[PDB]
Curated annotation (Swiss-Prot), chain B:
Disease linked to the protein: Diamond-Blackfan anemia 10: A form of Diamond-Blackfan anemia, a congenital non-regenerative hypoplastic anemia that usually presents early in infancy. Diamond-Blackfan anemia is characterized by a moderate to severe macrocytic anemia, erythroblastopenia, and an increased risk of malignancy. 30 to 40% of Diamond-Blackfan anemia patients present with short stature and congenital anomalies, the most frequent being craniofacial (Pierre-Robin syndrome and cleft palate), thumb and urogenital anomalies.
Modified residues (Phosphoserine): 53
One GO BP: translation
Protein name: Small ribosomal subunit protein eS26
GO cellular component: cytoplasm; cytoplasmic side of rough endoplasmic reticulum membrane; cytosol; cytosolic small ribosomal subunit; extracellular exosome; membrane; nucleoplasm; ribosome
Assembly information from the UniProt record: Component of the 40S small ribosomal subunit.
Organism encoding this protein: Homo sapiens
Primary localisation category: cytoplasm
Gene: RPS26
Bias kind Basic and acidic residues: ranges: 86-96
Keyword line: Cytoplasm, Diamond-Blackfan anemia, Disease variant, Endoplasmic reticulum, Phosphoprotein, Ribonucleoprotein, Ribosomal protein
Annotated transmembrane regions: none
Swiss-Prot record, chain C:
SUPFAM superfamilies (UniProt xref): Nucleic acid-binding proteins
The gene coding this protein: RPS28
Alphabetically ordered keywords of this record: Acetylation, Cytoplasm, Diamond-Blackfan anemia, Endoplasmic reticulum, Nucleus, Phosphoprotein, Ribonucleoprotein, Ribosomal protein
Phosphoserine carried by residues: 35
Subcellular location(s) of the protein: Cytoplasm, Cytosol; Cytoplasm; Rough endoplasmic reticulum; Nucleus, Nucleolus
Single annotated GO MF: structural constituent of ribosome
Cellular-component GO terms for this entry: cytoplasm; cytoplasmic side of rough endoplasmic reticulum membrane; cytosol; cytosolic small ribosomal subunit; extracellular exosome; nucleolus; nucleoplasm; ribosome
Record-annotated membrane-spanning stretches: none
Family under the similarity heading: Belongs to the eukaryotic ribosomal protein eS28 family.
Source organism of the structure: Homo sapiens
Descriptive protein name: Small ribosomal subunit protein eS28
Biological role stated in the UniProt entry: Component of the small ribosomal subunit. The ribosome is a large ribonucleoprotein complex responsible for the synthesis of proteins in the cell. Part of the small subunit (SSU) processome, first precursor of the small eukaryotic ribosomal subunit. During the assembly of the SSU processome in the nucleolus, many ribosome biogenesis factors, an RNA chaperone and ribosomal proteins associate with the nascent pre-rRNA and work in concert to generate RNA folding, modifications, rearrangements and cleavage as well as targeted degradation of pre-ribosomal RNA by the RNA exosome.
From Swiss-Prot, chain D:
Keyword field: Acetylation, Cytoplasm, Isopeptide bond, Nucleus, Phosphoprotein, Ribonucleoprotein, Ribosomal protein, Ubl conjugation
N6-acetyllysine modification, residue list: 32
Taxon lineage: Eukaryota, Metazoa, Chordata, Craniata, Vertebrata
Main location: cytoplasm
Family: Belongs to the universal ribosomal protein uS7 family.
Encoding gene (name): RPS5
Protein's recorded name: Small ribosomal subunit protein uS7
Organism this protein belongs to: Homo sapiens
From Swiss-Prot, chain E:
Subcellular compartments: Cytoplasm; Nucleus, Nucleolus
Entry keyword annotation includes Manganese: no
Modified residues (N6-acetyllysine): 53
Protein name as catalogued: Small ribosomal subunit protein uS9
Protein task: Component of the small ribosomal subunit. The ribosome is a large ribonucleoprotein complex responsible for the synthesis of proteins in the cell. Part of the small subunit (SSU) processome, first precursor of the small eukaryotic ribosomal subunit. During the assembly of the SSU processome in the nucleolus, many ribosome biogenesis factors, an RNA chaperone and ribosomal proteins associate with the nascent pre-rRNA and work in concert to generate RNA folding, modifications, rearrangements and cleavage as well as targeted degradation of pre-ribosomal RNA by the RNA exosome.
InterPro entries linked to this entry: Ribosomal_Su5_D2-typ_SF, Ribosomal_uS9, Ribosomal_uS9_CS, Ribsml_uS5_D2-typ_fold_subgr
Gene: RPS16
UniProt keywords, alphabetically: Acetylation, Cytoplasm, Nucleus, Phosphoprotein, Ribonucleoprotein, Ribosomal protein
RNA sequence: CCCAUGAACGAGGAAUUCCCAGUAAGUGCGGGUCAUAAGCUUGCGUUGAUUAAGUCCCUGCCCUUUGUACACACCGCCCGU
C-alpha cells in the first residue's frame, strides 16, 4: 500500500536523471534502486525530434514524476545525475538543470546530489573516425 | 614558413606522444597538441541553486561540483572560441587569461 | 506569486537575432537587497520598479 | 461649499493611501482642464505611457485611416456624456476608474527563440512602463484591425473602455488573450 | 507710456487692450459658454469662481480676436487672460498678488507661455516629400 | 457640376521600395515645361499618425588582427577524363 508512519518525517527515493543531448530521463526508484516508482522522459512530453532534450520537456517530465511520486507516498529524493558517459560526452545535457529545478519546485525535498556518469579507466574507440565527424 | 617555434605542440625530447579524441568531433589529436580545458562548475546552476537549497533536507548541504576535462582539436577549439588567432607578436605570449 | 519591487542599477542590453529582448540588474530597496539580474523590456525609469512577482526567475544569459 | 475642483472632495473622500497612482498622475504643470491638448507623445520613448492610461486609451484609439489623430473624437468621448454620468450615477463615482484592470493587467510576455523553432517563447516581464507599452499597443492594434465596422461605435464609446481601461477588475477580452498567452510564456520557468 | 503685448499663439491673436471700463464677461464679445464651434468653451469659467464679483468691475480688456485654427485661437485666450491679470496686478497693488494668481494659473498648466515649435519641413530631392523617396528599381 | 443601370465595394502570387514628428500617408496650391498647356518634376502649405530609441540575422560600409597559390585583385586563380 503506502508508508503510513511518521507524518512529520521524510520518505526518501532516488531520482536517476539521465540528461543526454538527445533527450532526458527522470527516473525515481526505491532507495536500493531495484524497484522503480516512475520513469518519465522528455520524449513522452513533447512530440518532435529536437525538443526531446529541451529544458521545457525536462521540467514537464520532472513535474509529472513529482506528481506521481507524491501520489505514491514518496516525499524526498536523492539525486543521481548522469551524462551519456562511456567514451562519449561526459557533460549532462540541457535537461538536467531544468529537471532538478522542477523537482525542487514541485513540492519535493532534495537529499544528496551526486554525479554517476560512467567514466572509463580507458575506453574503446569512439564512433568517429580518426579525423572525427566533419559536419 | 615556420609559424610556431614549438610547432604548435609541446613535444620536446620525445618521438611519439599518445593521441586523444576531441570531446567535440572525436578527432585524433596528440595529447600535447590538444587544447585542454578543465571546467569545475556547480552541478546545480546559479538560477537553480536557490530552489535546490530551499528544498534541501539538510541545512547547509554545500552542493557538489562537476569536474569535466575537455580536449579540443585546433579546429573545434577555434570554432568554439576557446582560443582565437593572435598577431605575430601576441602569439608568443603564453600567459593564461586572468579570468 | 508575490510582486517584489526591484530598482534597476545597470541595463545589460538587448538580445536576439535583430535585437528583441532586454536584460538589466535589479536590487531590493530595504529588503536585504541582492544584486539579481533579470530580463526587462524597453522603458526603465530612473530607479524604476521591476515586478519580481516571482523570486526564482533570474533570466539566464547566453 | 469647500470642495476642491468640480467633481472631487476632501472632507470625507478618503482613499487610505497615496500609493495608487501607477498610470494616473496629475499633480504638476501637465494639467489641462480637459484632455484636449493636441501635442506629441512620440518625441522620445516612454512618452506614450506617460500619457495617462485614461488619455492613452481614449486618444490612442486613433488608428487605420479614417479617425487617425483627429482629436475632436477624443474630445467627444471624454467630454460628452461622461461628466454628466459622473453625478448621474448616484453611487460612488470611483467604481468606473477602479473596476478595470488590477486583475486584468498582464504581468508577463515573451520573446522569440533561437535560430530554428517558434513553438515556445522566452519569458520576459517589465516594470509597468514597457508592459503597458507593448500590451496595450497590441491591444489597440488588434481592437482596431478586427473591430473595424464596430457596432460599439463613437458617441457611446466611453462606457465600456472607461470601465475596462484604468484599474480594478479582470473582465477585458483582448486582455484575456494576452493573459492566456502570458501564462503560456510564464511556463518558461 | 503704453505696455501692450496682448495674447497670441501659433497663428491667432487676441489683442487685449487693458484699461478701466465695464469689463463684462465675454469671449469674442459673446457669452460664457456660447461659442459657435462649441469645442473648448470651459477654459475661462474656471478662475472667476474663486475671487468674486467685485474683482472684475474695472478691468476692460477690449480684444480684437483674429485667426483661424482652434489650437491657435483657443489656448491664446488663456495666455491673454494670464497676461491681463499679470499686468493689472503688477501695475496696481504689487507683484505679490500677481505672483499668486500667476502661480496658480501657470503651475496649473505649462502650455500658455510655450507654443508648439513644430512646423512643416522642407521637401527634398528625388522624393514626394521631406523624408519619403521615389521608388528605386533594379 | 449632375440623373443611382452596381465596382471581387471593408487588408492582397514567390519578388521587392520608401520611411522615425509636424515625419509617413491623405489633400490641394504655385513654379518649370507652356497657349490656360501635367497623370512629370520641383517647391508650398493643410489634416496628421501607427511603430522604434535597437541590432548586426539579411544587404552593405568602416578602424584592427589573421590566412592567401589572388594583384585582370574571388565575376580571381586553378585541378582532372
Amino acid at each position: 500500500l503506502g508508508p503510513q508512519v511518521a507524518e512529520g518525517e521524510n520518505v526518501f527515493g532516488v531520482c536517476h536523471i539521465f540528461a543526454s543531448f538527445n533527450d532526458t530521463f527522470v527516473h525515481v526508484t526505491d532507495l536500493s534502486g531495484k524497484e522503480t516508482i516512475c520513469r518519465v522522459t522528455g520524449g513522452m512530453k513533447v512530440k518532435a525530434d529536437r525538443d526531446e532534450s529541451s529544458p521545457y520537456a525536462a521540467m514537464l517530465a520532472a513535474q509529472d514524476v513529482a506528481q506521481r511520486c507524491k501520489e505514491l507516498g514518496i516525499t524526498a529524493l536523492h539525486i543521481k545525475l548522469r551524462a551519456t558517459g562511456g567514451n562519449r560526452t561526459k557533460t549532462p545535457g540541457p535537461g538536467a538543470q531544468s529537471a532538478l529545478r522542477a523537482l525542487a519546485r514541485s513540492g519535493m525535498k532534495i537529499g544528496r546530489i551526486e554525479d554517476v556518469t560512467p567514466i572509463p579507466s580507458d575506453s574503446t574507440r569512439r564512433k568517429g573516425g580518426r579525423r572525427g565527424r566533419r559536419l | 614558413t615556420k609559424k610556431r617555434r614549438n610547432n604548435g605542440r609541446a613535444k620536446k625530447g620525445r618521438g611519439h606522444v599518445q593521441p586523444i579524441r576531441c570531446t567535440n568531433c572525436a578527432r585524433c589529436v596528440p595529447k600535447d597538441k590538444a587544447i585542454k580545458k578543465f571546467v569545475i562548475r556547480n552541478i546545480v546552476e546559479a538560477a537553480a541553486v536557490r530552489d535546490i537549497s530551499e528544498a534541501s533536507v539538510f541545512d547547509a548541504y554545500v552542493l557538489p561540483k562537476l569536474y569535466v576535462k575537455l580536449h579540443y582539436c585546433v579546429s573545434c577549439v577555434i570554432h568554439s572560441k576557446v582560443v582565437r588567432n593572435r598577431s605575430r607578436e601576441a602569439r608568443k605570449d603564453r600567459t593564461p587569461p586572468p579570468r | 506569486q508575490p510582486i517584489k519591487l526591484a530598482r534597476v542599477t545597470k541595463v545589460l542590453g538587448r538580445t536576439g537575432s535583430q535585437g528583441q529582448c532586454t536584460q538589466v540588474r535589479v536590487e531590493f530597496m530595504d529588503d536585504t537587497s541582492r544584486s539579481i539580474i533579470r530580463n526587462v523590456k524597453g522603458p526603465v525609469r530612473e530607479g524604476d520598479v521591476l515586478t519580481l512577482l516571482e523570486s526564482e526567475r533570474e533570466a539566464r544569459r547566453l | 461649499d469647500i470642495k476642491l475642483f468640480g467633481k472631487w472632495s476632501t472632507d470625507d473622500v478618503q482613499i487610505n493611501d497615496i500609493s495608487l497612482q501607477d498610470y494616473i498622475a496629475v499633480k504638476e504643470k501637465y494639467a489641462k482642464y480637459l484632455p484636449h491638448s493636441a501635442g506629441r507623445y512620440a518625441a522620445k520613448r516612454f512618452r506614450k505611457a506617460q500619457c495617462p492610461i485614461v488619455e492613452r486609451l481614449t486618444n490612442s484609439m486613433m488608428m487605420h485611416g479614417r479617425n487617425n489623430g483627429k482629436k475632436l473624437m477624443t474630445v467627444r468621448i471624454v467630454k460628452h456624456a461622461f461628466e454628466i454620468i459622473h453625478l448621474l450615477t448616484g453611487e460612488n463615482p470611483l467604481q468606473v476608474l477602479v473596476n478595470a484592470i488590477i486583475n486584468s493587467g498582464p504581468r508577463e510576455d515573451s520573446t522569440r527563440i533561437g535560430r530554428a523553432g517558434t513553438v515556445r517563447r522566452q519569458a520576459v516581464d517589465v516594470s509597468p512602463l514597457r508592459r503597458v507599452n507593448q500590451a496595450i499597443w497590441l491591444l489597440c492594434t488588434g481592437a482596431r484591425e478586427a473591430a473595424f465596422r464596430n457596432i460599439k461605435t463613437i458617441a457611446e464609446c466611453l462606457a465600456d473602455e472607461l470601465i475596462n481601461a484604468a484599474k480594478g477588475s479582470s473582465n477585458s477580452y483582448a486582455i484575456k488573450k494576452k493573459d492566456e498567452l502570458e501564462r503560456v510564456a510564464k511556463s518558461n520557468r | 507710456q503704453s505696455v501692450q503685448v496682448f495674447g497670441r499663439k501659433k497663428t491667432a491673436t487676441a489683442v487685449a487692450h487693458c484699461k478701466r471700463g465695464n469689463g463684462l464677461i465675454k469671449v469674442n464679445g459673446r457669452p460664457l459658454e456660447m461659442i459657435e464651434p462649441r469645442t473648448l468653451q470651459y477654459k475661462l469659467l474656471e478662475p472667476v469662481l474663486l475671487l468674486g464679483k467685485e474683482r472684475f468691475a474695472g478691468v476692460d480688456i477690449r480684444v480684437r480676436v483674429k485667426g483661424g485654427g482652434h489650437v491657435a485661437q483657443i489656448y491664446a485666450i488663456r495666455q491673454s487672460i494670464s497676461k491681463a491679470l499679470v499686468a493689472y496686478y503688477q501695475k496696481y497693488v504689487d507683484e505679490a498678488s500677481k505672483k499668486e494668481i500667476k502661480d496658480i494659473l501657470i503651475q496649473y498648466d505649462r502650455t500658455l507661455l510655450v507654443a508648439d515649435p513644430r512646423r512643416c519641413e522642407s521637401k527634398k530631392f528625388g522624393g514626394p516629400g521631406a523624408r519619403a523617396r521615389y521608388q528605386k528599381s533594379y
